[PDB]
Ligand binder design. Structure first.
Ligand SMILES: Cn1c(=O)n(C2CCOCC2)c2c3cc(-c4cccnc4)ccc3ncc21
Length: 802
């Protein structure tokens, strides 16, 4: 009756929030309760007119390469209604001024040109100008905002030393327990139990007295229990709870097994109980509830020493002297926003006094607030190394400066960063709740970015599910309708992918596929595309649908577009795959999209193709089909072969000369990008190219060479084992490489988090690849040398690949 809505949300999320069986406290229920207010606040504050039409706009400057297309200076936008007419408009002209009521929707898209924004500052206008396409719009009627209607004793006096009683470890099928007090990645104090023979049950009943006191336990503290026999099981328990109270009583904790990592920081217990390892522990209880309460300059030499510490890379660890230097002169270090991550590492979190000294130091934020926004440091303070609620919130406060365009560039990386938050309700989760609820595009990607983890991560599904339910409860009836239509389709397409895979390691398979898709089309008739929400896919082209030939078996699906106002009847091609982890490809594609923005600021377009890719469920998702594209393997199935393929598929010579240029930029782009990320040693079948000349890597799901610059690519430029194109390539390569190096800290910390949340020494790769330390001229030469490593090898490495 009154519960029907929750069972609808339950099916959208893919996990039950009301079901509380793997919970030892009430944090999820308390954060479900606490999340109501920032949803109520956002639902109410959003302009219902601009919420319904979600104009995807930017406040960033129009790039160098895009002002080349505009001349007079005017742009042509063709308005449709059967009868169409072109209108010459100034780049700085508002959409209403063009209209001279009615709205300017994009043809075949739920994309609109609205608000007090210049047309040059629209993401669809910039997109068309980049791709050299016409701006086809339609004089449509604004959508009803009615469709989005939303349904409605003190701690610092407990000077006693802390202790935990290790009762034992009950397991269904030598060993010792390692008890740790943790804050960030920094272990405060360790204690082990005496080794005992490994059996079905191992009792100890011994108390482990720690060096740290109750008073000195920081908000965010963790009792991390580990089972060593060398590490085999782990579990965590927040010593300070959500209601600021120290943990008391008996706790049985089901432990996570093994095979550093974000999964190893989780406060959640293992849901499996009949097969998992447990741990009975006792925590000292009291009659009254224990509750946590709330100059000189610097000499020229010690200034230079501190300046060198700030200027180093994030991965560079601080010594004991570096930590003392930074802490003593914290008031100076506070006047340099770049020192904050390193300074907040230098503080002794296991000392109530040193913590209180930081908390009051942070009240002098006049300098941090007034600073120019840096995503680098903001992401730095949100990682595993920072467990303090206050420090993290200073980073979340800067995320408010980010306009909807930028929130989209880091939505996935911010969603992952929630894994490092000690408590469920956090400034970050709330931040992602505001931005998702304010914007429909952000909200759509939020849904899928959260649903990605809820369905595959047993470690963080609990936390993420309460954040999804909170977003869902405020998006409005329209988005809730759209998501049911997406869930219903992917859940339908999930069975088909799995049933077909359970028939192969042919005509039988291809007939059985259409035999199943037939009893599927007879709901829904339309659904938004999870990786491109503007595009609405209609009914299937069941005759075009096939099962793909590789080691894995994906579903090549083609859907007609639901919008009849579309320019072409070109179907929407979607790959539905199983057995591969799309969570890592999502992460790689995101850094690629970030790299492009870095190049945009530096006035460069390296023509990357970061194809839509959404992780949907348990090792299953969907991938965008790139139209008129094939792999290098299919083009070979040597030197001449690619340039012969480009001319052959090219209509005019004008278009071919465009095809070789689109090749040099995209090739240089994938050369710099895949090198930095360390995914350049890839097989020919994992490198694609459009009939337009647009090259792009794929299958990112986890002798040597730095990148792929084979002779067939070189022959396209006009070189065999210099050229006017190869010189243009080398120059744009360096120009692109040096741009990414200006954002070292950003890339370093983006990669670091990517590793921990998606997948110590492995991370160190970007230090060397982004040539940390070396000057602008030394890096130019270093990259040009890596070009020559590909020239020397040629077909060697490509041949080596089995
Ligand atoms: C025409 N055509 C293909 O043949 N294929 C492939 C199918 C699987 O064998 C490799 C080639 C693709 C595409 C494959 C991906 C992709 C698939 C899995 C992982 N990462 C990326 C993306 C876009 C694509 N577009 C077009 C297209």
């Amino acid at each position: 009756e009154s519960q029907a809505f929750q069972r609808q949300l339950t099916a959208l999320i893919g996990y039950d929030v009301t079901d509380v069986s793997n919970v030892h406290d009430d944090e999820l229920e308390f954060t479900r309760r606490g999340l109501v207010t920032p949803r109520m606040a956002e639902v109410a504050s959003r302009d219902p007119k601009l919420y319904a039409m979600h104009p995807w706009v930017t406040s960033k400057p129009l790039p160098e390469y895009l002002w080349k297309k505009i001349a007079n200076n005017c742009i042509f936008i063709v308005i449709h209604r059967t009868t169409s007419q072109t209108i010459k408009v100034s780049p700085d002209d508002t959409p209403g001024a063009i209209l001279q009521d009615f709205v300017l929707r994009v043809c075949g898209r739920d994309e609109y040109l609205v608000g007090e924004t210049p047309i040059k500052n629209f993401q669809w206008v910039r997109h068309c100008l980049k791709n050299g396409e016409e701006i086809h719009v339609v004089l449509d009627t604004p959508p009803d905002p009615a469709l989005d209607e939303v349904r409605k004793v003190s701690l610092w006096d407990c000077d006693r030393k802390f202790r935990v009683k290790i009762r034992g470890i009950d397991i269904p099928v030598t060993v010792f327990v390692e008890a740790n007090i943790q804050h960030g990645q920094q272990v405060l104090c360790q204690r082990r139990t005496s080794p005992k023979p490994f059996t079905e049950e191992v009792l100890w009943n011994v108390w482990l007295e720690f060096s740290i006191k109750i008073k000195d336990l920081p908000k965010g503290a963790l009792l991390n229990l580990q089972i060593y026999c060398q590490l085999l099981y782990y579990v965590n328990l927040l010593l300070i709870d959500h209601r600021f109270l120290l943990r008391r009583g008996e706790y049985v904790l089901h432990m996570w097994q093994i095979s550093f990592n974000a999964d190893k920081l989780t406060s959640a217990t293992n849901p499996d109980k009949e097969n998992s390892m447990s741990i009975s522990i006792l925590l000292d209880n009291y009659c009254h509830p224990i509750a946590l309460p709330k100059r000189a300059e610097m000499p020229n030499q010690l200034r230079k020493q501190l300046e060198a510490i700030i200027a180093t890379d994030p991965l560079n660890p601080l010594t004991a002297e570096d930590k003392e230097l930074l802490w003593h002169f914290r008031y100076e270090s506070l006047k340099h926003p770049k020192a904050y991550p390193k300074l907040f590492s230098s503080v002794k979190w296991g000392q109530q006094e040193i913590v209180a000294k930081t908390y009051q130091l942070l009240a002098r934020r006049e300098v941090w607030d007034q600073s120019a926004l840096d995503v680098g440091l903001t992401m730095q303070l949100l990682d595993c190394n920072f467990s303090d609620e206050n420090v993290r919130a200073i980073a979340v406060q800067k995320l408010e400066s980010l306009e909807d365009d930028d929130v989209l560039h880091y939505l996935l990386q911010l969603v992952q960063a929630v894994k490092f938050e000690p408590y469920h309700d956090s400034a970050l989760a709330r931040f992602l709740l505001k931005r998702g609820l304010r914007n429909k595009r952000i909200g759509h990607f939020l849904f899928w970015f959260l649903r990605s983890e809820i369905a595959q991560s047993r470690h963080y599904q609990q936390r993420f599910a309460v954040i999804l339910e909170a977003y869902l409860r405020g998006c409005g009836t329209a988005m809730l309708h759209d998501f049911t239509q997406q869930v219903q389709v992917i859940e339908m397409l999930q069975k088909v992918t799995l049933d077909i895979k359970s028939l192969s390691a042919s005509s039988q398979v291809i007939s059985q596929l259409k035999q199943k898709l037939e009893n599927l089309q007879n709901l829904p008739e339309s659904f938004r595309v999870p990786y491109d929400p503007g595009l609405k896919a209609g009914a299937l082209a069941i005759e075009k649908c096939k099962v793909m030939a590789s080691k894995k078996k994906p579903l090549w699906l083609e859907f007609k577009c639901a919008d009849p106002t579309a320019l072409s009847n070109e179907t929407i091609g979607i790959i539905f795959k199983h057995g591969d982890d799309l969570r890592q490809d999502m992460l790689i594609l995101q850094i690629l999209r970030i790299m492009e923005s870095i190049w945009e600021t530096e006035s460069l377009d390296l023509c990357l193709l970061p194809y839509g890719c959404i992780s949907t469920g348990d090792k299953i998702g969907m991938i965008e089909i790139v139209k008129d594209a094939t792999t290098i393997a299919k083009i070979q199935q040597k030197d001449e072969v690619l340039n012969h393929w480009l001319k052959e598929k090219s209509p005019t010579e004008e278009k071919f000369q465009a095809a070789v240029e689109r090749f040099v930029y995209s090739c240089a782009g994938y050369c710099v990008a895949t090198f930095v990320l360390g995914i350049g040693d890839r097989h020919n079948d994992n490198i694609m190219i459009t009939e337009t000349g647009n090259l792009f890597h794929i299958d990112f799901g986890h002798e040597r060479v730095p990148f792929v610059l084979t002779p067939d690519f070189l022959f396209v430029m006009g070189t065999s084992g210099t050229s006017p194109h190869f010189q243009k390539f080398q120059d744009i390569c360096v120009k692109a490489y040096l741009a990414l190096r200006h954002h070292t800290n950003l890339l370093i910390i983006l990669f670091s988090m990517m590793l921990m949340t998606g997948m110590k020494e492995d991370i160190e790769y970007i230090r060397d690849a982004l040539t940390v330390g070396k000057n602008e001229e030394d890096a130019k030469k270093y990259f040009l040398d890596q070009i020559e490593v590909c020239r020397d090898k040629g077909w060697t490495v490509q041949f080596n690949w089995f």
